[PDB]
Design a protein around this ligand. Structure first.
Ligand code: MYR
Ligand code: MYR
Lengths: 163, 163
C-alpha cells in the first residue's frame, strides 16, 4: 500500500491553524509549548508503527538512530533531510540541523512571544516515536530561524535504553 | 524554488490533533464543523497564492475550474486525484469523488458524532481559494467514508462570479 505524496503547503498552514487555536486557548506561550509537545508525543507513538513498516531498522546504537531519523524519517514525513552534527564525545548527544523547516514556511513570530517554540510538536514526535523503540530521549530546540538564527537546531539527548 | 514533498502521515495525524483540540474546546459537533470551515477559509485565501505560482490557470468557466481543482490542486496539496462526476444540466454543480481522503487515514468516528464533518476544513479551503479567483462557491460533504459510504463526496455549487 503506497503512501500518498504531497506538497507541504497545506500541512504547514494546517499546523499554523493548530498553533493559532492553542494560542487562543492558552494565552500563555509556555503552555502552548507543552501542549504542542504532548500532542507531538501522542503522534509519535502512532507514527512509529507506520515508519517500521516502511523502513528496515531495529535497535543498533544511538548513532545509527541519528542517521535513520535525519535521512529516512524526516525525509519521509517532512520532505527534508536535516544534517547531523556536534556529537558529544560520549556519543549520547547530537544535533539535527534544519536549514529548511516546512512547519515555519510563511510564518513570522509576533514580538514578546520569544518563549514560544513554534515547531515544538517535533520534539514530542521524536520523543514518543523513540520511546516505542525502547529509547528514552530528550529533544529540544536550541536554534530557531523564527528567532533569527541561520538554521533551526534540535538537540537530541539519549537518556536511557528502556528495558 | 521547488516545494518539499512529503508523505501524508504526519499531516493526517496533525490534522487529527487539531480536530481533537477543537472537540475539547467546543463539545458541540456543529461548532467544530464551523470552526473547521472558518480555518479552512483562512487557509484557502493564502493557499491560492501558492497555487497560481505553480499552475498556469486564470478564469475560464466552472467546468475548467472543476478539472483544475481535482487534477492539479488536490494532487499537489493532498497527493490524490478526486473524480469529477454528476454535473448539473446547467453546469453550475459537480461532485468531487474522493475514493481515498488522507485526512481520515487512521480515523474512526465515535458514536453519536454523526453531525461531525471530520474533514470539513476542505470545504473552507475550497471556498476561500475560489473566492480569490472571483468565484463564489458552496462546498459541502454529502458522502463520507467515516459514515460508511463507499466514497467521500464533496458537492460543489457555483453561486456567482465576483466582479
Ligand atoms: C534504529 O536502528 C533506529 C530507529 C529509528 C526510529 C525512527 C522513528 C522516527 C519516526 C518519527 C520521526 C518524525 C520526524 C518528522
Ligand atoms: C481557473 O481556470 C481555475 C482556477 C482554479 C483555482 C484552484 C485553487 C485551488 C487551491 C486550494 C485547493 C486545495 C485542495 C486540497
Amino acid at each position: 500500500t503506497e503512501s500518498k505524496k504531497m506538497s507541504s503547503e497545506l500541512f504547514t498552514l494546517t499546523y499554523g491553524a493548530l498553533v493559532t487555536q492553542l494560542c487562543k486557548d492558552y494565552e500563555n506561550d509556555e503552555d502552548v509549548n507543552k501542549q504542542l509537545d504532548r500532542m507531538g508525543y501522542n503522534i509519535g507513538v502512532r507514527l512509529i508503527e507506520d515508519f517500521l513498516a516502511r523502513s528496515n531498522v531495529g535497535c543498533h546504537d544511538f548513532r545509527e538512530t541519528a542517521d535513520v531519523i535525519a535521512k529516512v524519517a524526516f525525509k519521509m514525513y517532512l520532505g527534508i533531510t536535516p544534517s547531523i552534527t556536534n556529537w558529544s564525545p560520549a556519543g549520547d548527544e547530537f544535533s539535527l540541523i534544519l536549514e529548511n523547516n516546512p512547519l515555519v514556511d510563511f510564518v513570522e513570530l509576533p514580538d514578546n512571544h520569544s518563549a514560544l517554540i513554534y515547531s515544538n510538536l517535533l520534539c514530542g514526535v521524536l520523543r514518543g516515536a523513540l520511546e516505542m523503540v525502547q529509547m528514552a530521549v530528550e529533544a529540544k530546540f536550541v536554534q530557531d530561524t523564527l528567532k533569527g538564527d541561520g538554521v533551526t537546531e534540535i538537540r537530541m539527548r539519549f537518556i536511557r535504553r528502556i528495558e
